[PDB]
Structure 1
Amino acid sequence: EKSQSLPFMNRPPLLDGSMAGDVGFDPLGLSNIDDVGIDLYWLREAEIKHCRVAMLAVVGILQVEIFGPAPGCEMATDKCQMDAFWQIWGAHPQYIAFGLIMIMMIEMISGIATTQGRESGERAPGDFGLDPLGYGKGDAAGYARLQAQEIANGRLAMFAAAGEIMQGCTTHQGALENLMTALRDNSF
């Protein structure tokens, strides 16, 4: 049986289309890793966390570069968010350190939930029970569509958040005016 994404390659044996974004795209065989505290559960939890962090980072850039910083943080004034971080750190550094320790407690608890959820079987990877509106209660076909839409928007936002870091740390302008610069440079 061949991979859908790479039809010249065989299907990776631990990927069977059960997870949401599974089209058999593992050419390096990384889903077969089972040694240094890392397996398919750990990589799926890492993918989903990289999905959700990058999804929030993209709209977190596009909120400030369109509507400005939040009130109490009007000292930013820079569209480059890699530089606007250091103006908030320059004036109100305690709230960033408030969030970074609040993340530190959340992430250390999530690291226990990952390794206890792997040893047992009562936790899907990336699952925290955070469904307060309750989309997962009915229409399992429509709930698997939301599981696939999270992965599809999250895999796209991974490139976008990594790009906005890198083309913010190299052009020092901001994402949306990097976009206008590219539009006038490559117009035909």
Structure 2
Amino acid sequence: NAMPFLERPPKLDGSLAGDVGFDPVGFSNYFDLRWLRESELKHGRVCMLGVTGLLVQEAVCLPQFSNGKTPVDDFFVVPAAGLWQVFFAIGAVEFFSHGFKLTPGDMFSEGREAGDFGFDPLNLSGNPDALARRRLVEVKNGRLAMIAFGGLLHQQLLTGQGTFEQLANFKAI
């Protein structure tokens, strides 16, 4: 296990992917595991997209936009009206995907498993074994994306330099 000196969490069973028994506090003991897994998948997917955005906006800038010194500054140079529609379009996407069941009690009522919405433009989710492998890869890369996005954002905020450009010259503080 992840904590050999501790015991396995009671609510934690190996049904979900990425289960290593890592829950030293009892978040799963006090909150629904389906809700926690949905939040984990949402954070991980948002962080994958954020990592790609941080690595791309330093290299590619839209012609109808101003290119800031860093992607964090790319956020600032965008007009606030664009940021607000981004916010409200994401909110509309949340409303459509959750079926107007934002509250934790209303969510997971009509099955939906945990963190599943229905998204397969290309059918790569047929066989259950490959589906489970894809789930494990997805959750691991999502957690790695959370850590990596935190690191990239904070290093960009501190040094004021892009990630690849920071790799060009370290400039230790």
Calculate the TM-score normalised by the size of structure 2: 0.87
Superposed structure 1 runs of 4+ greater than 4 Å apart: none
Q: Distance in 2 between matches of 1:129 and 1:86?
A: 34
Amino acid at match of 1:155: R
CA distance in 1, matches of 2:67, 2:124: 37
Residue 39 of structure 2 corresponds to which residue in structure 1?
Answer: 46
Q: Aligned runs of 1:133-152 on 2, under 5 Å? A: 133-137=122-126, 139-152=127-140
Using the TM superposition, name which of 44-53 and 161-170 deviates more. 161-170
Q: Which amino acid aligns with 2:24?
A: P
Match of 1:71 in 2: 63
Q: Identify the residue that residue 6 of structure 1 maps to in structure 2.
A: 3
Pair 1:124-2:110 in alignment: no
Whole-angstrom CA distance in 2 between matches of 1:142 and 1:30: 29
Q: Which residue number in structure 2 is paired with residue 104 of structure 1?
A: 91
Residue pairs, 1:78-93, within 5 angstroms: 78=69, 80-89=70-79, 93=80
Q: Secondary structure at the match of 1:162?
A: helix
- State how far apart, in whole Å, the 2-side matches of 1:130 and 1:82 are: 30
Q: What's the CA shift for 1:107?
A: 2.5
Larger relative contact order (Cα-Cα within 8 Å, sequence gap ≥ 6) = 2
Q: Does 1:95 align with 2:82?
A: yes
In 1: Cα distance, 2:62 partner to 2:46 partner: 20
Distance in 2 (CA, whole Å) between partners of 1:179 and 1:121 is: 48
What's the % identity of the aligned pairs?
A: 40
Q: 2:146 aligns to what SS in structure 1? A: helix
The 1:121/1:25 distance shift into structure 2, 3 A limit, reads farther
- Structure 1 residue aligned with 2:54: 61
| Kept after mapping to 2: 8 A contact 1:50/1:158 | yes
Deviates more, 1:107-116 or 1:52-61: 107-116
Corresponding residue number in structure 1 for 2:23? 26
Which segments of 5 or more consecutive residues in structure 1 lack a partner in the other structure? Answer: none
Q: Secondary structure at the match of 1:170?
A: helix
How many correspondences in the alignment? 170
